[PDB]
Design a protein around this motif. Sequence first.
Motif, PDB file in Angstrom:
ATOM      1  N   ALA B 171       0.745  -1.340   0.352  1.00  0.00           N
ATOM      2  CA  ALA B 171       0.296   0.176  -0.091  1.00  0.00           C
ATOM      3  C   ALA B 171       1.279   0.881  -0.111  1.00  0.00           C
ATOM      4  O   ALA B 171      -0.061   2.286  -0.471  1.00  0.00           O
ATOM      5  CB  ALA B 171      -0.879   0.035   1.638  1.00  0.00           C
ATOM      6  N   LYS B 184      -4.666   7.252  -0.976  1.00  0.00           N
ATOM      7  CA  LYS B 184      -4.434   5.745  -1.309  1.00  0.00           C
ATOM      8  C   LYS B 184      -4.738   5.884  -2.625  1.00  0.00           C
ATOM      9  O   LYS B 184      -4.743   4.523  -3.488  1.00  0.00           O
ATOM     10  CB  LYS B 184      -5.697   5.315  -0.391  1.00  0.00           C
ATOM     11  CG  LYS B 184      -5.369   5.486   1.166  1.00  0.00           C
ATOM     12  CD  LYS B 184      -5.575   4.052   1.731  1.00  0.00           C
ATOM     13  CE  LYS B 184      -5.619   5.023   3.254  1.00  0.00           C
ATOM     14  NZ  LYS B 184      -4.493   4.490   4.630  1.00  0.00           N
ATOM     15  N   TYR B 187      -1.941   2.753  -4.359  1.00  0.00           N
ATOM     16  CA  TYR B 187      -2.802   1.693  -3.489  1.00  0.00           C
ATOM     17  C   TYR B 187      -4.295   1.304  -4.778  1.00  0.00           C
ATOM     18  O   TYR B 187      -4.256   0.259  -5.187  1.00  0.00           O
ATOM     19  CB  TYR B 187      -3.752   2.241  -2.347  1.00  0.00           C
ATOM     20  CG  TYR B 187      -3.087   0.415  -1.705  1.00  0.00           C
ATOM     21  CD1 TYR B 187      -2.685  -0.519  -1.987  1.00  0.00           C
ATOM     22  CD2 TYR B 187      -3.875   0.511  -0.304  1.00  0.00           C
ATOM     23  CE1 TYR B 187      -2.701  -1.942  -0.950  1.00  0.00           C
ATOM     24  CE2 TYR B 187      -4.324  -0.877  -0.334  1.00  0.00           C
ATOM     25  CZ  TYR B 187      -3.451  -2.617  -0.554  1.00  0.00           C
ATOM     26  OH  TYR B 187      -3.368  -3.475  -0.445  1.00  0.00           O
TER      27      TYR B 187
END
Lengths: 237, 300
Positions: B171, B184, B187
């Motif tokens: 991640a 994020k 990811y």
Amino acid sequence: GAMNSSNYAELFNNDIKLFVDDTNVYRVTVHKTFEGNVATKAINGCIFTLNPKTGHLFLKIIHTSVWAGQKRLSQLAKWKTAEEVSALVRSLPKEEQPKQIIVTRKAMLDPLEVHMLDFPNIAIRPTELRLPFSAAMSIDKLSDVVMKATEPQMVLFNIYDDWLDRISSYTAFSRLTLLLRALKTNEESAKMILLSDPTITIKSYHLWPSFTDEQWITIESQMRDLILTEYGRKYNV
Amino acid sequence: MNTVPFTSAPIEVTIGIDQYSFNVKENQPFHGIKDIPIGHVHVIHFQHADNSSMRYGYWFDCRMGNFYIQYDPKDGLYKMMEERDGAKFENIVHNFKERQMMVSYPKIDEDDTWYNLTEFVQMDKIRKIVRKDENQFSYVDSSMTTVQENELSDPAHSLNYTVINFKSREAIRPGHEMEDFLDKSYYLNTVMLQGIFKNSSNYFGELQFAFLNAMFFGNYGSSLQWHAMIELICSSATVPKHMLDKLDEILYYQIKTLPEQYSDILLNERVWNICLYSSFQKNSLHNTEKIMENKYPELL
Ligand SMILES: CSc1ncccc1C(=O)N1CCCC1
Ligand SMILES: CSc1ncccc1C(=O)N1CCCC1
Ligand SMILES: CSc1ncccc1C(=O)N1CCCC1
Ligand SMILES: CSc1ncccc1C(=O)N1CCCC1
């Protein structure tokens, strides 16, 4: 898991560990602007990374240039702290790397965990203890090296001076936390206590004087009195 | 319209087919469900009357074979089986229909609920999450654990959902620690969409399958997967506009279908409040936020 009063002695076993305190990383003065608004001016700060068994203080000085052009600085400060602690671990030989890192503030857990993913065997732990490490900038020689820094810099001091020649690391940590709690509750008085006797010199390379064993007992008692005194002044007791 | 005949119903059981549930009494003359819409996956599921422990069921697509249910008195459950003899099967079904021994899949014509819940769910992808390659249908029950749950114990019986861990080297790019943890998008878009799922349809298919397993079986691990895949999108600052609009529709129908009285066992307060009110996409899920605020305002 978390470090508290039940497992206090684990600090002084032979598993290498470091405390990390970030309360002096991002430091500002707040002032009025010509237009009568408020603004901040950053000043140099430091990461306080301490081995409580040996006294080794790895003081990473945070120069104000690291904030230039950055947003959300209180949040960045936690990630910068974690970046620098991770860089310190990687610089150390394998046999010197800590097995645990205890952060004094819970907001450091995720930033340090993320920066330390490469080290799955190093435990990142909070603590329920209220440790007075914020007062490290009340130690004159530490404050001096931080304020004089013109660039990022790491400096090494033993925060116990030579105490471990005569006392255990449990007792040394207890002395340190009492001195810092006093300097945090009344810095002027605490410093008065520590240097009221010109014959006990603060040695050039030491944070506190060369007190004898008997003199440390007097000093330690005067510090408890100060803390109790301030407690009474604060709460009208 | 296809049919799943039952040999018999020897034990009292609640039978569900997609969002519908009905009671069959012990030794009642029940011989299946007819008029099952072609074009969608379906799930036929069971809760025994004498032991509501172990809800279990079967995902299937009538286009892939002729399937029927037969109770096994040794293993104590209703099993799905494939009949390879086509003419035998057609003859069996026809007799049961003529005797009106089969309940009718009650699809209201206005109603797109099942399509909207299974839009991106394909049998081929179900069969990679649930590994039992000798059958064309897939068994799932409430106790089955996911691959992630087992990292943190029988691997043949696991739900092989895609592992999603926000504090993992997958991640987090070395040198982008703060960036990748607080946003994020790397990811979501590079690791998961471009890398593992290949496209958003496959990602939504797993998300929808995880929701349905969690709701129909009360499978805890499935519920963890569903919320993890929502949170990963909501916690990304850079998401294609079409994915956000589709996610809003997906979640809207999921929340609409959830039993009002299961919202304590199927909805995670932290994820939903974060997603609707703090996340980068807090303002991008208008339909989902409105139904959530009107149906489950306690949770928020
Ligand atoms: C005050 S720091 C200190 N003190 C005494 C001896 C060594 C160090 C030091 O920098 N260390 C790096 C890892 C091992 C110890
Ligand atoms: C296969 S649906 C079915 N089966 C048997 C008895 C009733 C129904 C039915 O019309 N239903 C509509 C609401 C829930 C169930
Ligand atoms: C949808 S999760 C669910 N459903 C039905 C029954 C129990 C649970 C649940 O909370 N669980 C947590 C531990 C394992 C099961
Ligand atoms: C797909 S989330 C999941 N799945 C299975 C077991 C645990 C979790 C979970 O909540 N986790 C939180 C942090 C990493 C793991």
